[model samples]
Target chain A: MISLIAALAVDRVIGMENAMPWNLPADLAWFKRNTLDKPVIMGRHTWESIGRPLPGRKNIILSSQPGTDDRVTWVKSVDEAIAACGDVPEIMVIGGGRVYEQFLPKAQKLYLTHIDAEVEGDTHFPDYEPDDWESVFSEFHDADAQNSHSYCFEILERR
Target chain B: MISLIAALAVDRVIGMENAMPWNLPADLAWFKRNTLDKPVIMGRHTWESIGRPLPGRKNIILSSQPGTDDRVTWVKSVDEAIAACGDVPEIMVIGGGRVYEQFLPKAQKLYLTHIDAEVEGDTHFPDYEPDDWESVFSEFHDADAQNSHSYCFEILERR
Candidate 1:
């Protein structure tokens, strides 16, 4: 199975000026919980944005340019990324803008954190038809001392 | 009390090319329930956006532009719009893009219908801080026979 994971603002704003608009610790925890022990596929831009491979998982970075690390395997295309995953049960498509749009059609599941504010951004998450995806799990999270915005963690499956 | 009512896409999009991007019957139902009996204060841009015949209710439109009729009253400013409401206990601020931002800081009540999908639009709703308000009512509506997208109806009040 293929799953896509992302956190986005109300304007579908994912990144502004090449960085995340807001920081919520809970979402990081949520990201870790969902993708833990799974191979995470990301674009080269995403790899550059994070600056390093995440711990405890295989990092498959997709880019035409050459990049190799003990923690990350660089591949040139979607087929190459999947081939790199071998027999993993599910591949988590962690993204930059283009990566999500590219992987969206093939993804069976989605892990989304909807940040409860409209924000400024240059790059946005792609749109989807709500009816085409069934909600599998959902919950609202209020902004508090640690989180700067109210948000929701939702899991969706293609219907 | 002042109330601002708006339907926004997941991307905070409220309008595109001077019209709503999607049609939502339930949200239209909610709008009338809240504002049908009372006055609806909107911008001249929004006034031009639709064209509506909201009978049995006063339409207080804000604009320096010239317009007036039997059911509609055009006011030049925020103070004038509220003043036109007279002794009414609450006024509903129906919006255009700029109108929401102008009234958000002063308005105490919010009636927001959050559409469940990202959409394309040139005009957008304003960003708000979640910690600045408290939720009073919220309910989810799934896309079905009538609606095109799953959405939520939320009522909030300033803290």
Candidate 2:
């Protein structure tokens, strides 16, 4: 199954300067817990922003440049990345804005950390049609000493 | 205690042409379930938009003119409405747009139904600093044959 994952501020913004605007360690842990052992796809900018390959997952970077590395595999397009998953039960499209938009249409499910406030940002997740999907699960997280924002982890699936 | 309640679309819109843009019967039911038998405060515009006092609750409208009916009571301002709610354990602030912004600062808790997708609308809920509040509870609802949007009922309290 094809799925997308992201943490967006209430205003729909995902990133401002090639990185998330707020730091939430719990959200990062949540991301890691859900995506572990999955084939994860991301755009070149997202990979560059991360600065390294994620551990415990097959990192597939979407780019049209020469990339020959043992740490990760590079594919020229989202379709190529999906093809590379090769019958995997689920493939996660981790993101920057452009990559999320590219995979949104084909995604069967969405794992979203919905931050409870608007934030200053230059990039955002694309708006989706609400009628096309339905919430399957959600759990709220209040901001604490270790987390900077109150957010909810919600899973939505196409109906 | 004063609580604010609203259903916001993904773009932060609360109303369109003075009415909610989408029909979600379950959400309306949820609102009634929470506010029944409580004093619900709303602005003149919100009262006008709703067209009548809501049933099973003490309907308090914020307006300059005198209310000459048993169904509803009119107050000159938000402070007057708050004062009128004396001795009650909780007061509900329902809204249009301006009314919500007016009461946001004084609200001790928030009851929000966060719709999962953007909608077309002219009126919107005001943005507030997330640091000032924390989520206390939440429940998710999926869109089905009866509902048009997948939304979550989230309760947030002042930090």
Candidate 3:
């Protein structure tokens, strides 16, 4: 199955200064655990943004040349990433912007963490509509009103 | 101006296993600082990888039906983001895959952070002729023998 997992803001903003504006260790841990053993695809910038690979998941970078590492493979197109995944239990298209645009059409499910707040940033989320997707489920995160961050976890499925 | 910042290896392995295959905090900081206060564009999935918004700029998203976010403004076309960013000093077209493809034609400059090693991965840089951009500046980053993380920051302005 093709599933997309992302943490976005109330405005759908993603990054500022190369990393997430807020440090949610919990969210990072979730990504590490969920994407483990899955094929993770991302843009060069997104890869750079993270500074290094997360543990466990199979890393697949979308690039235009051959590679030298045994674990790291290279590909010229999005098709190659999906192909390399080769019937993996799940395929993940990680970000930086460009990688997401290329793979959204091929995605069947979206796992999103919606934070309630605005950030100062240079990166943004792609514009999307409600008609194309159906909200399958959602749960509010952090019922504590005193929490500095307010958010929810929402699941979306292709209509 | 529009630009794309990417970290590439000798073999074009930009990322692997849904994580960055390298360690370069300086590059990450540079990516953030350069894109701040500008309208940065990306695909829906790319935004997810970020999982949140930066603090000072606009988060413009490109998706057919992206999730709802008060923090992000969604647009259906790249042109829309361009038009929105017209008043700003610059706009960065961040990427996943399709987002880069959609904006490559509109890119005026490309900030490439070329690594000094050949690694592996699935996602990659867009295929555009070298002549398409003029290399205005370059600075090499040292990674030492302990790691193959050395890189060069290349500023390619569209000629």
- TM for chain B in all models? 0.93, 0.92, 0.87
In candidate 3, what are the lDDT values of residues A47-122, reduced to their tens digit? 6555556667778777665654455656788778888888777788777567766678778888887877676667
lDDT of each: 0.82, 0.82, 0.70
Error of 2 at A87 (Å): 1.7
TM-score of chain B of 1: 0.93
Interface DockQ of each model:
0.01, 0.01, 0.02
lDDT of each residue in A41-158, candidate 1, tens digit only: 9987778667778889999999988876757899999999899999989999999789999999999999999987676677888888999999999999876534656789999999
Please give the C-alpha DockQ score of model 3: 0.02
Residues B1-159 of candidate 3 have per-residue lDDT tens digits of 677766676765554434453445667777887887777887787777666776687888888885578898888888787776777667887776677767778788887788765645666777878877789999986663223367788888887
B25-99, model 1: which lDDT tens digit per residue? Answer: 677899889998887888977776556647767888888877855558988898898898999878888888788
CAPRI-style docking class of model 1 based on DockQ: incorrect
- The runs of at least 3 residues in candidate 1 whose Cα sits more than 4 Å from the true structure, single-residue gaps closed, are B1-159
lDDT tens string, model 2, A25-45? 678798999899999999887
| TM-score per model over all chains | 0.50, 0.49, 0.49
Fraction of real interface contacts that model 3 preserves: 0.00
